[PDB]
UniProtKB/Swiss-Prot annotation:
Changing G13D: In GASC, JMML and OES; also found in a breast carcinoma cell line; somatic mutation. This is GTPase KRas. Pfam families: Ras. It is a lipid-anchor. It comes from Homo sapiens.
Length: 168
């Protein structure tokens, strides 16, 4: 079965793990397991054909992570996540995008900008500012809530579409 490797990056605390687990848990009966894995698989249908997503969550750059760059280089597409009530995590998006280009040795890498925690009323990053940043990068932008499930499936599906566009 075809397998696409998706890597989730961004500052710690923005909801990288919550988004990933919410995607995996949606639409299925999951074993109760309190383990937090750093990677999860999910079956999807791409152009009528069942495929596997392998989704890996990475540590924010404020944490040392010996394998982080090697892990990222295996990624075919990246979810760059910030929290809408965390201005620094949005400012950090530039770092993550440049670090993705570094580890992939490429100027053209599939990515999606994700503004998470959109259930919160304490936003400090205007939706327009993130929309305009994504457009300037040529990438999609979506606001999500791992809490309410708003946009969660759609964020990962949009990334899969970006990967497919790149492959073609
Ligand atoms: N309100 C709200 N809290 C969230 C959301 N996503 C994550 N959180 C919380 O933010 C904290 C960090 O989430 P986590 O997924 O562990 O962050 P990570 O370090 O980016 O993986 C936890 O307390 C989560 O429950 C969201 O969409 N809304
Ligand atoms: Mg955390």
């Amino acid at each position: 079965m075809t397998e696409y490797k998706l890597v989730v990056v961004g500052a710690d605390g923005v909801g990288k793990s919550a988004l990933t687990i919410q995607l995996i848990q949606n639409h299925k009966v999951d074993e109760y397991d309190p383990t937090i894995e750093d990677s999860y698989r999910k079956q999807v249908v791409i152009d009528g054909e069942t495929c596997l997503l392998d989704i890996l969550d990475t540590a924010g750059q404020e944490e040392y992570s010996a394998m982080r760059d090697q892990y990222m280089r295996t990624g075919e597409g990246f979810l760059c996540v910030f929290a809408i009530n965390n201005t620094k995590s949005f400012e950090d998006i530039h770092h993550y995008r440049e670090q993705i280009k570094r580890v992939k040795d490429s100027e053209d890498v599939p990515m999606v900008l994700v503004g998470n925690k959109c259930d919160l009323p304490s936003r400090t990053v205007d939706t327009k500012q993130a929309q305009d940043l994504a457009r300037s990068y040529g990438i999609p932008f979506i606001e999500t809530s791992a809490k309410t499930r708003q946009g969660v499936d759609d964020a990962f599906y949009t990334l899969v579409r970006e990967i497919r566009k790149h492959k073609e």
